Amino acid sequence: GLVPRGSHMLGDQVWKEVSSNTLRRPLIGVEKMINYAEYYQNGNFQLTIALSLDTNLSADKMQERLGLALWTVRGYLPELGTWTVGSSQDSTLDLDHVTFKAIQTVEEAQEWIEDTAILVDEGTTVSEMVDLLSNKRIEPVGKQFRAYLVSQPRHGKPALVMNASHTLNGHRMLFQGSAILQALVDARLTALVASSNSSREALEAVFVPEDISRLARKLPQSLNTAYADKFRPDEADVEAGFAKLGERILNSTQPTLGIPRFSTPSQNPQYTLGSANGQPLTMLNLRRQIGVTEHRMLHRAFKKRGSSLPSFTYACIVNSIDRRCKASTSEADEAPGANLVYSAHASRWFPAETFMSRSPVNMAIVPGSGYVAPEELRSKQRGRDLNESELFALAKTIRAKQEQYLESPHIISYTAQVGDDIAAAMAETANKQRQAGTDPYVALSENSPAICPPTLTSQGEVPIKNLYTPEGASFDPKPKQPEYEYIYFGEGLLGGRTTDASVCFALWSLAGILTLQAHFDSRFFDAQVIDTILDDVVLQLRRSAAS
């Protein structure tokens, strides 16, 4: 047992001790680009997810357990305590690293708990909390994760609402939320609360100073180092990555249809979620939800027709954008194509063990690209007004182009250098905009293209245990008035944040419920048009599944 199995050389060493009880590693790849965008673009990409709860726990029980449950989860998920904004010794800002401070005292632990396990004030609903959190950046900048318990809403079910930086997160939020819900019904925690006269006294009974020597192996690594450890890219693989970059750059310059942004940001936006702090809530998440039964039937119907739910949804988005906006980067009368902007998850090439406990990859985005030719998205008979057969053909074309682009993991090879260059250029652009006195919303839009190309990322259903009892997590169905404590989630809500002048569509599923949503700032795009596109897509999905 002296020769460990597997390939883990880089991942075993990325986190280094930089000071007492403090680990640090450099950010590499997409995670570095995200960290810079969150700092310089007001929290761009940050995530809010609400898990709506059925439970027989009172609000008071959930409130008195939340902080200790979070503390317990932190013990095996130190990723919750990472930080991405620091300074060098010359005092200059440092966005290039992630750090982890191992907590040594009860006082320090209690401070982290109170900053991270928030009890939401009476009345506020779950939907209101997702609106609020998605409409601002996480503070203080550098904080990676915060949990909000909505246990006293004036109507509706309670929820666990998580707000996270995207730098080291994504899919992982569901696993983090699941761990918190499981901890909330652990009998040992219930007994601890029952045996203690304050939450700090409960913490004192269990607290152990955190140990960097053993926690390093549980902290997340960049996808880039996991990629190097698994694939050991050689010169030809590196050059293959550059070829995928060149294809993506080319696709971004070819004539494309898309959604036109406003030439200048609206000073009086009418489409808001209310106001907070005297300013309107213009970050919108326009959602279309499809329930368990209909989702199952749609997924089957498209498969039976030789198609797929995600590829047909993409075809409908492309075609609706074309018909509703009639906007393209073609400087002539020529019909445009469509530049496809989308992400893939690294699980397409990496096994499940890459995303577990040992040096996990917690942000597994791999950028995709593709380009639909004008002849593939217009009909010689109908022009833009594609019939059902022509939409199925467009879906097939999209699916084939994505499968071709995503065949190889070596896309990842280009992202370290591109990440460095994009990050450096971001900081330089921000500096130039500050020197120019540019208005912040002008700064967030002036470098965005005039035409936003069709941007859809799809995530298929991944089974997650969503029932929690004192025996642990399980896939069993929601119980009907059991004798034992339980928490169950059958529905989630996503609030995405897109602060630059783009429109991002997301198709995803949780507990069998499918959501198609668009997130964007209504200061840059007409929300009526986006709502019309979403309605068009859902109507066509329903029509073509019934055909």
Residue numbers in the entry: -7 to 539
From the paper:
In the MEL biosynthesis pathway, an acyltransferase from Pseudozyma tsukubaensis, PtMAC2p, a known excellent MEL producer, has been identified to catalyze the acyl-transfer of fatty acid to the C3′-hydroxyl group of mono-acylated MEL; however, its structure remains unclear. PtMAC2p is a monomer and forms α/β-folds which are composed of 18 α-helices (α1–α18) and 24 β-strands (β1–β24). The crystal structure shows that PtMAC2p possesses a large putative catalytic tunnel at the center of the molecule. Interestingly, the HXXXD motif, which is a conserved catalytic motif in the BAHD acyltransferase superfamily, is partially conserved as His158-Thr159-Leu160-Asn161-Gly162 in PtMAC2p, i.e., D in the HXXXD motif is replaced by G in PtMAC2p.
Two types of PtMAC2p crystals (A and B) were obtained using the purified enzyme. In the type A crystal, residues Met1 to Ser539 and residues numbered −7 to 0 (GLVPRGSH), which are from the DNA sequence included in the pET15b vector, were modeled using a 2Fo-Fc map at 1.0 σ. In the type A crystal, electron density map of a PEG molecule in the reservoir solution for crystallization is observed. The PEG is bound near His158 in the cleft of PtMAC2p. Hydrophobic amino acid residues, mainly from α2 (Val22, Met25, Ile26, and Ala29) and α11 (Phe234, Leu237, and Ile241) helices, are concentrated around PEG, although a hydrophilic residue, Arg240, is also located near PEG. These residues form a hydrophobic surface in the cleft.
